Design a protein around this ligand. Structure first.
Ligand SMILES: CC(C)Cn1ncc(Cl)c1C(=O)Nc1ccc2nc(-c3ccccc3)[nH]c2c1
Ligand SMILES: [Cl-]
Ligand SMILES: [Mg+2]
Ligand SMILES: [Zn+2]
Length: 313
């Protein structure tokens, strides 16, 4: 109980920053997550034995894919940690608890393929879950692990609190379906601009948490340029494999998934920053001003992609 996780001095300091990279030492990532839970939530939020058993079972249910892997899970949890720590008073005890767990679990059992590829392949998951196919799967996997013997980190919660935290996690994980982000941000933009935004309105809070989930999920675009650039290679390794699998179904893939259109990556990144990332962090900064460093880091990376196009790199 008087047992803190401690990090080396450079990590202790840099983990507080939005652009922190969790490093290449896989064996430190569980400790990095527990450290963030302890500071974000409290050393009391979870029984350490159950938490450690939960974390190791979550890790085991991430696959050895180039990008949608255990490192992505802990990376997305860290961005959520940074948002929560910079917005101390805005979130409930249940929300702090639920949201770090939601982030760790949000891509459980990902195969490196989009909802669209599952649909075209006619994968069994696409018949079970007609929309947000992988995201409904990720939530199902989260519940399955929570129900393993000795894995119920939420055991000390009252029945009502338990039902509330699972509903926070479910909504948070479904919100990582990027297809749903466009309409969520549009509604939040209108609400902010007309001054109707009310954080006491549960349906408004749901929308704000949804945007936080998009922001943490896309956080590779908010790292220092060398991290952003090297992460893009892992993302494209998955996209191009999916494109190969589309060609095997006799379907021409979209250019972003076609390894033959590698040359159009820089312009593709520009479209993504302008259509998704920048708008996402802009609306997040309007609602939660202390998240401005994410928007600043995103604009810096946009200007690096612009320099790549101009042959300056
Ligand atoms: C991991 C994912 C599921 C979500 N994600 N997370 C972080 C980041 Cl970045 C992304 C992401 O979606 N990046 C992304 C988005 C749209 C793109 N369009 C092109 C393109 C277009 C024409 C020619 C060549 C390339 N490349 C793209 C890359
Ligand atoms: Cl603190
Ligand atoms: Mg996902
Ligand atoms: Zn993700």
């Amino acid at each position: 109980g008087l047992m803190q996780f401690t990090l080396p001095v450079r990590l202790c300091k840099e983990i507080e920053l939005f652009h922190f990279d969790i490093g290449p030492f896989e064996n430190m990532w569980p400790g990095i997550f527990v450290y963030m839970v302890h500071r974000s939530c409290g050393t009391s939020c979870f029984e350490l034995e159950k938490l450690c058993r939960f974390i190791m079972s979550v890790k085991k249910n991430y696959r050895r894919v180039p990008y949608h892997n255990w490192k992505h899970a802990v990376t997305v949890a860290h961005c959520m940690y940074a948002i929560l720590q910079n917005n101390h008073t805005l979130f409930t005890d249940l929300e702090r608890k639920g949201l770090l767990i939601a982030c760790l679990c949000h891509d459980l059992d990902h195969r490196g393929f989009s909802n669209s590829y599952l649909q075209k392949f006619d994968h069994p998951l696409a018949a079970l879950y007609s929309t947000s196919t992988m995201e409904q799967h990720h939530f199902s996997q989260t519940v399955s692990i929570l129900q393993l013997e000795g894995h119920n980190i939420f055991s000390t919660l009252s029945s009502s609190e338990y039902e509330q935290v699972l509903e926070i996690i479910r909504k948070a994980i479904i919100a990582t379906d990027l297809a749903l982000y466009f309409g969520n941000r549009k509604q939040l933009e209108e609400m902010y601009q007309t001054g109707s935004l009310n954080l006491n309105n549960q349906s408004h809070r749901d929308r704000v948490i949804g945007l936080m989930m998009t922001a943490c999920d896309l956080c590779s675009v908010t790292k220092l340029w060398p991290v952003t650039k090297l992460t893009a290679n892992d993302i494209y390794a998955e996209f191009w494999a999916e494109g190969d699998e589309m060609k095997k179904l006799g379907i021409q893939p979209i250019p972003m998934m076609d390894r033959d259109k590698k040359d159009e990556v820089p312009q593709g990144q520009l479209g993504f920053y302008n259509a998704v990332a920048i708008p996402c962090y802009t609306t997040l900064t309007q609602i939660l001003p202390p998240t401005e460093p994410l928007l600043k880091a995103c604009r810096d990376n946009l200007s690096q992609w612009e320099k790549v196009i101009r042959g300056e790199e």
